[PDB]
Structure 1
Amino acid sequence: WGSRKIVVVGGVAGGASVAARLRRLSEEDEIIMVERGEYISFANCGLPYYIGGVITERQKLLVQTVERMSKRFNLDIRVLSEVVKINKEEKTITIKNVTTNETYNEAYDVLILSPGAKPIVPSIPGIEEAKALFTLRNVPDTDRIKAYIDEKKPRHATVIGGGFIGVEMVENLRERGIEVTLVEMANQVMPPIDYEMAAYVHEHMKNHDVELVFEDGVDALEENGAVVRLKSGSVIQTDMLILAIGVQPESSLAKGAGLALGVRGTIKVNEKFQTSDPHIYAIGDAIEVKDFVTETETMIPLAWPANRQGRMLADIIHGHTDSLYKGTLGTSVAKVFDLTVATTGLNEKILKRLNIPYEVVHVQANSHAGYYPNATPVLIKLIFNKDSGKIYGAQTLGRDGVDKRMDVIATAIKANLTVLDLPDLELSYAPPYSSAKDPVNMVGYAASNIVDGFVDTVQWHEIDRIVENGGYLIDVREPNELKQGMIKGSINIPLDELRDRLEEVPVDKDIYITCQLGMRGYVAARMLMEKGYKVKNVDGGFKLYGTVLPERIVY
């Protein structure tokens, strides 16, 4: 191969990963990495934890130092340097040294854009006057927020936006002993998960004394940001504000060079990360990707994709194209106090938006064998095609073993496995780690029973209307479990008595079954179907129902 001059814009997830592999592929290339901030390869993801005091050493946030990385990979690394213009027909970029104010042109053979995404700053009246309002992207942002806490001693904080980052900021502020109110315009935290799953998360957040405000936004900031006026008319008195309402692609360099843009102003790229200009590539948060599951054009700002893209791009530049980017699955995970919450693929809200017919199952299973100490429930929601078994997505929550289960399912999806394959994943079993049938196997069996037609089901959001319309709902729990509550219109026939009490089951009504988790309701469903009854099981049983619709519980 012939040596070229390769210029990388942005020195973090995408830029650093491509630069390092590029060097490993060639000792002769000139490789220049231009970064407007002071630091390269900092741990963006660690920022909230440094604020919370969980990460105690600021220096641990520096994954690579400029000195170390330039020497190791013979990189010309230029921090405090802003690319202000791309000149594509000239094949140069214009760079401003932020320290010295000198500007100059840098010629390139290949230009790689990884400039990321910037926080969305809303036009709220009084936002300019808001003294203690912060966004979180970089190290200076982090220093500033931490300095304010340490020096001004806020007693209450308001977080605007309940995405994965707003939520992590909620936790870390609580960790500092700051009282927290979270304001969300949606009816749930964490857009990636569905409403009934968020119901569990809300419970855990409120149990750690977080005030949750839903279906409300900031209408105005008054008193220099000390008074937050909500759209509804309610008021929050606060000592500081964290804005976490999402991100927008840093595509202004592309727009300025007349490069094609994708959805939501992302930089548009082809299969090889090439922009509309043959010599300019782009990766990371700023680019348009296809989602793995539907191959729909989207924007998914995550670290694994940025790193994977940068890594693959280096190979592609060197003509190693046997493997091209397959799209982004959207596997994500967050710590929420004592809970782990994970997601992959698509949720119900997106699939409805795309007019894609699906089914769901919710299966709660222990992190490991119940007979071994400290087992804890893991809840898996699996979304799939009733006909093909194609997995559209999954969501998981629980105190332990959640990341493991998400990773296996995410692995299965990318390997083009269907729900019918999940029960056949031979996973690691010993008492401290799993059960002879893992939670993943278990959710696979439940989904397979729907695919195979062994069970017909209704959802938590369907059951009440079904009962109003004349559905006969049999609760198969033991009588003592009913003290936890019940679904309105339930008639109690304990599962273990059911086979003896069939005469009590009407053959002139459509039968619906619930238990606590769905498992015993399924067994009852199987029995009744084999006896020639038309029957459906309430997916997730009462435990799920009561979490998402607590106000409808009958005692």
Structure 2
Amino acid sequence: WGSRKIVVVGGVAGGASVAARLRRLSEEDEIIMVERGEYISFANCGLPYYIGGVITERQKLLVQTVERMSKRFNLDIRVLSEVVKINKEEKTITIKNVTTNETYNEAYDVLILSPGAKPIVPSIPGIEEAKALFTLRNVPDTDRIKAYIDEKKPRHATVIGGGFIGVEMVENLRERGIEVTLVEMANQVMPPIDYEMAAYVHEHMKNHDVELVFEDGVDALEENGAVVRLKSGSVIQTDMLILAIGVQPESSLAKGAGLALGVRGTIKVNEKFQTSDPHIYAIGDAIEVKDFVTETETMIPLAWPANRQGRMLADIIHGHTDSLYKGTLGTSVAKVFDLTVATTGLNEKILKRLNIPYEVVHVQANSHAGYYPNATPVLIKLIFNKDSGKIYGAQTLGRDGVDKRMDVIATAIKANLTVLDLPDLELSYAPPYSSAKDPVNMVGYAASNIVDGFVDTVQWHEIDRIVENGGYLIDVREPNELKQGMIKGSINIPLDELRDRLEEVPVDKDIYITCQLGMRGYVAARMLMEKGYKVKNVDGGFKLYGTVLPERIVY
């Protein structure tokens, strides 16, 4: 290999990952990493936790220091240096030293853009004058929010936007003893998950005394941000505001160089991360990726992809192209007080948008064997193709064992496994860790029963209309469980008696079954089908139904 001058724009997840591997591939290359801020490789993900006082040491947020990293990898690292323009036909960039105000041009043979994505700042009347309004991207943002809390002693905070990071901000503010209201324009927190899964999250947040405001938005900020006027007309009195309404790719250098853009103003790249200019590559939050499941062009600003992309790009630049980026799966996770919430692939909302036929299943199963202490429920939703078993996505929540189940399913998906394969994953079983069939196996079995046609099912959002239309709903729980409530129109025949009471099941009506979790409902469905009844199980049973439609519960 012939040595070259490689310039990297941005010094965090994408930029630092590519620079480090680039050095490992060549001692001779000149590697320059240009970063507008003071810090390289900061823990962007750690910022909410430093604000919450969970991370107590500011310096812990520095994953690599400029000194250590430039020495270890012989990198010419230039912090407080802003790339102001790309000159692509000249093959130079224009850099401004922020401290000294000197500007200069820097020649490159290869240019790498990893400038990330900036917070979306809405044009809300009063926002300019809102003294205690904050966005969160970098370390200085973090210092500012923390200084304000430490010095001004806010008693109430408002969080605008209920995405994964909005939610983490909600938690960390509460942790500091600040009362919190969360404002969301959607009808749920956390866009990546579906409505009925969000319903559990909402419960857990409200149990920690978070006020949740849905289908509302900030119409105006009044009294210097101390007064929040909602679109609806309602008002929130507050001592500070955190804006977390999402991010937009930092593609201005690209636009300025006349480089091709992708969806939502991302920098467009080919399979090798190359932009429309042969000498300029781009990675990280700023680029368009294909989603792994459908290969649809999208933007998914996550750290694993940024790091994977930077690491792969280094190999690619050196001609090691046997492996190219397979797209982003969208595996993500958040701590929500006592809960873990995870997602991978696509939700129902995206799939409907894309006109893709799917089925879903909701299976609750214990984090580990129930005879062993401190087992806790893990709820897995699995979304899949009825004919092929192709997995479109999964969502999981629970107090423990959630990251594990998501990681297994995420692995299965990238390995091109179908729901029919999930029951055959030989996982680690001893009493503290799992059960003889892991929750992953279990969700695999439930989905396989649909694929194989052993059971037909209906959703929480279908059952009421079905009962109105003459559906005959049999609740197979024990009579005592009905005190928790029931679905309207239900008739109770406990599972264990059903075989002795088949004469009570009409042979002239379409039969619908619910239990508590769906498992006993499924057993009943199997029995009745075999007896030649047409029957469907209510997926997730009453437990799920009552969580998402509590106002419809009959007592």
TM-score tier after normalising by the smaller chain length: over 0.9
- 1:33-112 to structure 2, matched below 5 A, reads 33-112=33-112
2:93 aligns to what SS in structure 1? strand
1:432 aligns to what SS in structure 2? coil
RMSD (Å) for aligned C-alpha atoms: 0.1
Question: Partners of 1:273 and 1:194 in 2: how far apart?
Answer: 32
1:145 aligns to what SS in structure 2? helix
Aligned-residue offset at 1:97:
0.1
Question: 2:464 matched to 1:464?
Answer: yes
Question: Partners of 2:491 and 2:215 in 1: how far apart?
Answer: 36
1:413 aligns to what SS in structure 2? helix
Q: Deviations over 1:79-100 (max 9, x none)?
A: 0000000000000000000000
Percent identity at matched positions? Answer: 100
Aligned-residue offset at 1:476:
0.1
Q: Deviations over 1:117-164 (max 9, x none)?
A: 000000000000000000000000000000000000000000000000
Question: Partners of 1:493 and 1:18 in 2: how far apart?
Answer: 63
Please report the TM-score for the alignment, with normalisation by the length of structure 1.
1.00
Q: How many residues end up aligned between the 2 structures?
A: 555
Structure 2 segments unaligned to the other structure (5+ residues)? none
Aligned-residue offset at 1:372:
0.1
Q: Deviations over 1:293-339 (max 9, x none)?
A: 00000000000000000000000000000000000000000000000
Question: Partners of 1:252 and 1:484 in 2: how far apart?
Answer: 56
Question: Partners of 2:344 and 2:165 in 1: how far apart?
Answer: 17
Question: Partners of 1:118 and 1:444 in 2: how far apart?
Answer: 39
1:526 aligns to what SS in structure 2? helix
Question: 2:316 matched to 1:332?
Answer: no
Question: Partners of 1:405 and 1:309 in 2: how far apart?
Answer: 25
Aligned-residue offset at 1:474:
0.1
Question: Partners of 2:553 and 2:237 in 1: how far apart?
Answer: 34
Question: Partners of 2:46 and 2:527 in 1: how far apart?
Answer: 52
2:55 aligns to what SS in structure 1? coil
Question: Partners of 1:503 and 1:184 in 2: how far apart?
Answer: 51
2:365 aligns to what SS in structure 1? strand
2:59 aligns to what SS in structure 1? helix
1:374 aligns to what SS in structure 2? coil
Q: Deviations over 1:246-275 (max 9, x none)?
A: 000000000000000000000000000000
Question: Partners of 2:406 and 2:457 in 1: how far apart?
Answer: 24
Question: Partners of 1:166 and 1:24 in 2: how far apart?
Answer: 37
2:315 aligns to what SS in structure 1? helix
Aligned-residue offset at 1:435:
0.1
Question: Partners of 1:483 and 1:227 in 2: how far apart?
Answer: 43
Q: Deviations over 1:6-43 (max 9, x none)?
A: 00000000000000000000000000000000000000
Q: Deviations over 1:496-531 (max 9, x none)?
A: 000000000000000000000000000000000000
Structure 1 segments unaligned to the other structure (5+ residues)? none
Aligned-residue offset at 1:390:
0.1
Q: Deviations over 1:367-418 (max 9, x none)?
A: 0000000000000000000000000000000000000000000000000000
- The equivalent residue for 1:202 is 202
Question: Partners of 1:259 and 1:53 in 2: how far apart?
Answer: 42
Question: Partners of 1:473 and 1:239 in 2: how far apart?
Answer: 51
Q: Deviations over 1:156-186 (max 9, x none)?
A: 0000000000000000000000000000000
Aligned-residue offset at 1:358:
0.1
Question: Partners of 1:170 and 1:391 in 2: how far apart?
Answer: 32
Question: Partners of 2:339 and 2:458 in 1: how far apart?
Answer: 27
Aligned-residue offset at 1:232:
0.3
Question: Partners of 1:120 and 1:368 in 2: how far apart?
Answer: 42
- The equivalent residue for 2:246 is 246
Question: Partners of 1:275 and 1:203 in 2: how far apart?
Answer: 45
Question: Partners of 2:59 and 2:315 in 1: how far apart?
Answer: 31
Question: Partners of 1:482 and 1:56 in 2: how far apart?
Answer: 48
Aligned-residue offset at 1:494:
0.1
Question: Partners of 2:46 and 2:484 in 1: how far apart?
Answer: 40
Aligned-residue offset at 1:342:
0.1
Please report the TM-score for the alignment, with normalisation by the length of structure 2.
1.00
- The equivalent residue for 1:389 is 389
Question: Partners of 1:546 and 1:32 in 2: how far apart?
Answer: 57
1:28 aligns to what SS in structure 2? coil
Q: Deviations over 1:433-484 (max 9, x none)?
A: 0000000000000000000000000000000000000000000000000000
1:403 aligns to what SS in structure 2? helix
- 1:12-23 to structure 2, matched below 5 A, reads 12-23=12-23
Aligned-residue offset at 1:346:
0.2
Q: Deviations over 1:478-497 (max 9, x none)?
A: 00000000000000000000
Question: Partners of 2:508 and 2:19 in 1: how far apart?
Answer: 70
**Deviation >3 Å, runs of 4+:** none
2:323 aligns to what SS in structure 1? coil
Question: Partners of 1:58 and 1:483 in 2: how far apart?
Answer: 51
- The equivalent residue for 2:446 is 446
1:482 aligns to what SS in structure 2? helix
Aligned-residue offset at 1:217:
0.1
Question: Partners of 1:485 and 1:341 in 2: how far apart?
Answer: 26
- The equivalent residue for 2:24 is 24
1:253 aligns to what SS in structure 2? helix
Question: Partners of 1:51 and 1:473 in 2: how far apart?
Answer: 51
Question: Partners of 2:15 and 2:275 in 1: how far apart?
Answer: 16
Question: Partners of 1:165 and 1:448 in 2: how far apart?
Answer: 35
2:229 aligns to what SS in structure 1? strand
Question: Partners of 1:256 and 1:482 in 2: how far apart?
Answer: 65
Question: Partners of 1:485 and 1:146 in 2: how far apart?
Answer: 45
Aligned-residue offset at 1:361:
0.1
Q: Deviations over 1:228-253 (max 9, x none)?
A: 00000000000000000000000000
